Design a protein around this nucleic acid. Structure first.
Ligand SMILES: Nc1ncnc2c1ncn2[C@@H]1O[C@H](COP(=O)(O)OP(=O)(O)OP(=O)(O)O)C[C@H]1O
Ligand SMILES: [Zn+2]
Ligand SMILES: [Zn+2]
Ligand SMILES: [Zn+2]
Lengths: 65, 34, 49, 46, 1105
RNA sequence: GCUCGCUUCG
């Protein structure tokens, strides 16, 4: 649904690096170089950000509003 | 009324899927089982 | 060996459910069979008369 | 006592009393949700 | 010099999915039913009239189904969305109307729009509101754009009509009997009657058996009755082989024993063996020979048509059948039932067509009866059907047939059950796989073990691995990823082309030509089309004409050299698969065609029209040569496989690297993925179902198959990727168990949400009284609502946002007891639950019957604990054995601690190398920021992921140096770390935990109830009693089965041996011999039932000493 | 509450 704040394995703060990651996707950066520039050395945070699906906007499209 | 203390505080309170009309003062089980 | 009287069992063997949600009750098959047997006896008596 | 509800498409606060046909003004939708309560609720972060 | 290979060939698969594929089957079938078949059914019964008062008629002109609407408004329709039908617990149907003309008083009166019923509209169909809509318009209608659709919505529930599988009709089947006799059977089925006639060799001679004959009669007598009287012609028709004559000799001798030599004598003999259908109404007037001739012409072999009492075709058919029986009586070439080339698949379209035909015939019969009863005696007021056309008949019939699922067609004498099933909303994969299910005609009740096998005929058509593990193993199957079901054709141009291709008429020549080695019989849907020579030219010309487009691409042609029969199949329900045509060791599809397809110059229909890809049937592919790959193409190759991974189904597609695993592992993985927990759709929040499981933070898999991209599973994942380390830790993962990390679960890993529905109805009865909800019963002592009515709002309905505890009321419902002042008794909706629940939403709706429907959506947020079942996308189902802290978990040099620790011992016995390959590919992908593919019979190789690992500085085998977290010392062996896509299952320990106190008992037998929702206790079965007997524990068995279950104290009279009451015997009218006795209550019930059966048990009591 | 059907679970 939404990006988790904490990483499951280590616990590094990763929720604040989601939208900026999207910006790196709006830019010309690929996945690997963007994850490297974000400061994710260990592969657990890379899996957390890469394998995450942004379903919050799809649900808000069905929100009452 | 309760058969022991004579009170009229008979409440239907089910205890873990057991329908039970019991006195609320002394806990005397008036009726149980459905 | 030849039966002339039928022993209708107690209500403990024939449980009846009072379904207050509708205008009907739930009865077992034995009650309906006994009802049909009584109806047949009455019809036989009516035809004999 | 004013009982308030929310429509399914207009999402407007509608006040209807007991034994009323469930409807909503300026539309015809017939799905009427109840508003969230005002009582305090305590949650555990666990 | 390797053969060139088209790399983009797989691009043919998505284009095929654009017009056909997974869900398009039922949609197209329902569209064909509601657009073409219904008009044909109406035309077949366009005119209905009564015998009394002639010149009166009711003529149907044209029937329409229209758009779905709701009858809520007073005599006014209104467009309604499927989600609204789900919420209001109503049906999603459209009004079936028809324009008619009739005669009231001999004056023609016409109606242009008169509704007659309501047809439930399949979702995403032609008339469904969801078709032709954009995802934004889907959001406006509160419907998920990724929803497969194709299911009906009745009374708020989603029903799916499974694809039925049955044997093909009008086909000769040679099979052995119980005694080993190799006989034949033919189930000739026309649009009116289905008759299975058999032929046996029980005594060296052939007898023909039918349900309309009292005793089976020799086949030679039937031959003589059907026009051919010379025995030489019969023998020529049977065959000219010496062994054929030697086998048929006894039949000729038995025929010559009797005096049957002419057609009249044989017809009289047959009529003597005919029994009346229980005194058929009407004067017979010497119909014996006539009845025999009618049974021979119409009842026997219905599919073989006689022009005008000319049994030449029927004679040739039965002669070919006798020849097949004779040939099978030698070499045991017995045909098998499990061969799917003789199987037919009925979709929802054909079933709905039959049901609508039956309902329309019943409606017409009812109208004719009403006319006959009303018109001749009522009054000068002329009777009109409009005042009697009940519109609820067809509607109620359709609703009941779709909802209950049992179909009873008396016109066809078909009594089926389990046709419709509740759509499983466990996950998107669950519904997507259930939509493409196929049930067997065997209708499992016994251990057949003959259709349950995996036949090689299921290649490319049905998924081999996807099957429900349990009693339904092998009889419930799933369609493949790339498959299609054919429809019915006109069969006209087929006959024309066959006649123009040199097929000689069977009536022009005798049966002797049937015995020639070079003469091949050509059939058509079980009917003898004729004979031919040099069948290779015929088959090649027919295939070339089908490729050209003059013949429908779904018409199949096959050749059987053993029986020398050319079968031409054009009926619907046959399975076909697209294949690339190969001509002279080179496929017709080139790289340029794939480039044009990718750029959009052409589509799959262009490949079909340009003789590049063609559909092959099972019978047709039996004779064709298919190559799996380009390098496998040899000189004798006719077709090329599009993609091998299309062999697997939808559920099997989720398996990463399935060819590296064992088949039971794949089956268990499919079964668990059908139960995988995850998101359902984009409208899962507004959706209110009786049970829903959602994942807090779902993540798409790192190793995704191309099937996942095709089915868009990555948009709706049903699992999470966790850093799993394969090692043994603390001995809490002995057998299939796994160890979870406490810090991981604390940070949201595996967090799940369970949504339950609580529905209540306030209906108006016959009397002018209604169910009303009382306010919260405030306590006068504290001026606040009581603990039970604490969560209720001012209107007596629980408000969302608060927490509900056990035995708390959600709706303070009170209902009247009359149906003078009304007397209301309280029947509140209490919440039965071990844990607390939170109310998310409360929906209040009003039906046309003024009944208020209230639905509360309770939410529970659950954390993984001991007892929760977890899957690993490889059939390695496990239970959380221990939750260790983060510091107790081992750590690598980088400081990563594993979330899930799984036992390595599960690998050798199961050989799940695919799991290791998936782990390695996922590690490489999360290292280089890529998504590796675990496509079946392909995907990323081990060398590539090894190079990716060595490039990033990690080990090329996944094993990394790990230091033990407990002792702080390094481990002697390296640990296999990597991200694995683990999925949580709906099986929770909280829902499965059960404990039973004394509790309630059943009224009939005073024993605890059965189910947990009924708060029942466990059952000590027969085998438990056997074990207790073997142990010798008499007192424990007595306490369990008598004291603790159904103990009772009865009164038995020692004089007559009967049962008394309250220390008194009514039989003897005394109480001196009455004594108390302990007994199981079931034993007393048995004694009373036996006394009711005149089997009086007389108990002779005695002292215990 | 009785019945039946489907579905899963080991
Ligand atoms: N119909 C049944 N009757 C009795 N026990 C059953 C039944 N179905 C499942 N079980 C229980 O489940 C166990 C069956 O597991 P088993 O067949 O030994 O492994 P498996 O299911 O083949 O797993 P693999 O496929 O080998 O990984 C044994 C039995 O106690
Ligand atoms: Zn991390
Ligand atoms: Zn509104
Ligand atoms: Zn007695």
């Amino acid at each position: 649904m939404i990006i988790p704040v904490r990483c499951f394995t280590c616990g590094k703060i990763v929720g604040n690096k989601w939208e900026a990651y999207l910006g790196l996707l709006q830019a010309e950066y690929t996945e690997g170089d963007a994850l490297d520039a974000l400061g994710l050395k260990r592969y657990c945070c890379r899996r957390m950000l890469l394998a995450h699906v942004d379903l919050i906007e799809k649900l808000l499209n069905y929100a009452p509003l | 009324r309760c058969p022991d203390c004579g009170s009229t505080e008979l409440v239907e309170d089910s205890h873990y899927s057991q329908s039970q009309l019991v006195c609320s003062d002394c806990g005397c089980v008036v009726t149980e089982g459905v | 060996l030849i039966l002339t009287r039928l022993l209708v069992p107690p209500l403990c063997i024939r449980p009846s459910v009072v379904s207050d949600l509708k205008s009907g009750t739930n009865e077992d098959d034995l009650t309906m069979k006994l009802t049909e047997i009584i109806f047949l006896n009455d019809v036989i008596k009516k035809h004999r008369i | 006592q004013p009982m308030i509800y929310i429509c399914g498409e207009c999402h407007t606060e509608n006040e209807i009393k007991s034994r009323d046909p469930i409807r909503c003004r300026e539309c015809g939708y017939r799905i009427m949700y109840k508003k969230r309560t005002k009582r305090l609720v305590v949650f555990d972060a666990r | 010099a390797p053969i060139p290979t088209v790399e983009e060939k797989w691009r043919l698969l998505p284009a095929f999915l654009k017009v056909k594929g997974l869900v398009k089957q039922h949609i197209d079938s329902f569209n064909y039913f509601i657009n073409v078949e219904i008009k044909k059914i109406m035309k077949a019964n366009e005119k209905v009239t009564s015998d009394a008062d002639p010149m009166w008629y009711l003529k149907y002109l044209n029937i329409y189904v229209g758009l779905p609407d709701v009858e809520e408004s007073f005599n006014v329709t209104r467009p309604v969305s499927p989600h609204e039908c789900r919420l209001r617990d109503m049906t999603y149907s459209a009004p079936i109307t028809v324009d008619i003309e009739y005669t009231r008083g001999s004056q023609r009166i016409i109606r242009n729009a008169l509704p007659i019923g309501r047809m439930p509209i399949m979702l995403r169909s032609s008339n469904c509101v969801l078709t032709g809509k954009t995802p934004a318009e889907f959001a406006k209608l509160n419907e998920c754009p990724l929803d497969p659709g194709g299911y009906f919505i009745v009374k708020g529930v989603e029903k799916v009509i499974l694809i039925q599988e049955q044997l093909s009709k009008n086909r000769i089947i040679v099979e052995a009997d119980r005694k080993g006799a190799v006989g034949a059977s033919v189930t000739s089925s026309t649009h009116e009657k289905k008759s299975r006639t058999n032929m046996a060799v029980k005594q060296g001679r052939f007898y023909l058996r039918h349900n309309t004959l009292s005793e089976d009669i020799p086949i030679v007598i039937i031959f003589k009755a059907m026009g051919v009287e010379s025995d030489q012609e019969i023998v020529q028709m049977i065959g000219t082989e010496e062994h054929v004559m030697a086998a048929f000799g006894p039949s000729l001798e038995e025929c010559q024993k009797a005096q049957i030599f002419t057609q009249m004598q044989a017809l009289k003999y047959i009529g003597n063996k005919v029994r009346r259908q229980r005194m058929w109404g009407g004067g017979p007037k010497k119909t014996k020979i006539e009845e025999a001739r009618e049974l021979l012409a119409s009842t026997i072999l219905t599919h073989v048509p006689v022009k005008e009492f000319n049994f030449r075709a029927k004679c040739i058919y039965t002669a070919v059948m006798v020849r097949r029986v004779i040939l099978a009586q030698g070499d045991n070439k017995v045909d098998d039932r499990d061969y799917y080339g003789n199987k037919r698949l009925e979709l929802a379209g054909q079933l709905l067509s039959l049901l609508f035909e039956d309902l329309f015939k019943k409606f017409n019969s009812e109208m004719k009866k009403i006319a006959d009863q009303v018109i001749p005696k009522q009054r000068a007021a002329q009777f009109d059907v409009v005042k009697h056309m009940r519109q609820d008949q067809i509607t109620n019939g359709m609703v009941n047939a779709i909802s209950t699922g049992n179909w009873s067609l008396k016109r066809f004498k078909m009594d089926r059950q389990g046709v419709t099933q509740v759509l499983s909303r466990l996950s998107y994969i669950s519904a997507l796989g259930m939509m493409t299910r196929i049930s067997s005609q065997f209708e499992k009740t016994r251990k057949v073990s003959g259709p349950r096998s995996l036949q090689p005929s299921q290649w490319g058509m049905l998924c081999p691995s996807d099957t429900p593990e349990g009693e339904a193993c092998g009889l419930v199957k799933n369609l493949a990823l790339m498959t299609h079901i054919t429809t019915d054709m006109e069969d006209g141009p087929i006959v024309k082309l066959a006649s123009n291709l040199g097929v000689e008429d069977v009536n022009l020549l005798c049966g002797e030509e049937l015995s020639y080695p070079n003469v091949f019989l050509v059939f058509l849907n079980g009917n003898i089309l004729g004979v031919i020579r040099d069948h290779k030219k015929l088959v090649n010309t027919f295939r070339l004409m089908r490729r050209a487009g003059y013949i429908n691409e779904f018409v199949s042609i096959s050749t059987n050299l053993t029986d020398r029969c050319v079968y031409i199949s054009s009926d619907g329900g046959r399975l076909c698969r697209p294949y690339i045509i190969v001509k002279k060791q080179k496929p017709a599809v080139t790289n340029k065609h794939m480039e044009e397809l990718a750029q959009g110059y052409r589509n799959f229909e262009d490949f079909l029209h340009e003789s590049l890809v063609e559909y092959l049937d099972v019978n047709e592919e039996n004779d064709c040569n298919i190559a799996l790959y380009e390098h496998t193409i040899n000189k004798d190759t006719t077709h090329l496989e599009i993609e091998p991974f299309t062999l697997l189904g939808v559920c099997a597609g989720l398996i990463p690297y399935p060819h590296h695993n064992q088949s039971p592992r794949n089956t268990y993985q499919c079964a668990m993925g059908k139960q995988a927990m995850g998101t359902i759709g984009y409208n899962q929040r507004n959706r209110i179902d009786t049970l829903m499981y959602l994942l807090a933070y779902p993540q798409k898999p790192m190793v995704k198959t191309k099937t996942i991209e095709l089915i868009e599973f990555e948009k709706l994942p049903a699992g999470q990727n966790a850093t799993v380390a394969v090692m043994s830790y603390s001995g809490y993962d002995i057998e299939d168990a796994l160890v979870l990390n406490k810090a991981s679960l604390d940070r949201g890993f595996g967090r799940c949400l369970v949504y339950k529905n609580a529905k209540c109805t306030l209906k108006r009865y016959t009397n002018q009284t209604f169910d009303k909800v009382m306010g919260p019963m405030l306590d006068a002592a504290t001026r606040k609502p009581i603990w039970r009515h604490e969560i209720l709002d001012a209107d007596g309905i629980c408000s969302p946002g608060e927490k509900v505890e056990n035995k708390q009321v959600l709706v303070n419902k009170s209902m009247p007891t009359v149906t003078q002042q009304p007397q209301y008794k309280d029947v509140p909706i209490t919440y039965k639950g071990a844990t607390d629940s939170y109310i998310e939403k409360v929906m209040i709706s009003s039906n046309a019957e003024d009944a208020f429907l209230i639905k509360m959506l309770l939410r529970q947020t659950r954390r993984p604990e001991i007892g929760d079942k977890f899957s690993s996308r490889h059939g390695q189902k496990g239970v959380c054995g221990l939750i260790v802290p983060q510091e107790d978990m081992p750590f690598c040099d980088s400081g990563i601690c594993p979330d899930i620790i799984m036992n390595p011992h599960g690998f050798p016995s199961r050989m799940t190398v695919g799991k290791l390959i998936e782990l390695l590919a996922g590690k490489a992908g999360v290292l280089d920021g890529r998504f590796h593919y675990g496509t079946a019979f392909g995907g990323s190789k081990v060398k590539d992921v090894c190079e990716d690992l060595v490039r990033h500085g990690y080990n090329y085998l996944g094993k990394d140096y790990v230091t033990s977290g407990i002792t702080g010392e390094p481990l002697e062996a390296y640990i296999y770390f990597g991200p694995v896509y683990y999925q949580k299952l709906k099986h929770m320990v909280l829902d499965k935990m059960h404990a039973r106190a004394r509790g309630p008992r059943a009224v009939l037998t005073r024993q605890p109830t059965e189910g947990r929702s009924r708060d029942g206790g466990l059952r000590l079965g027969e085998m438990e009693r056997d074990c207790l007997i073997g142990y010798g524990a008499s007192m424990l068995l007595l306490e369990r089965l008598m004291i603790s279950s159904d103990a009772f104290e009865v009164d038995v009279c020692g004089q007559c041996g009967l049962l008394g009451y309250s220390g008194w015997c009514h039989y003897c009218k005394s109480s001196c011999h009455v004594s108390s006795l302990r007994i199981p209550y079931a034993c007393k019930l048995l004694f009373q039932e036996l006394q009711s059966m005149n089997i009086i048990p007389r108990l002779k009591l005695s002292k215990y000493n």
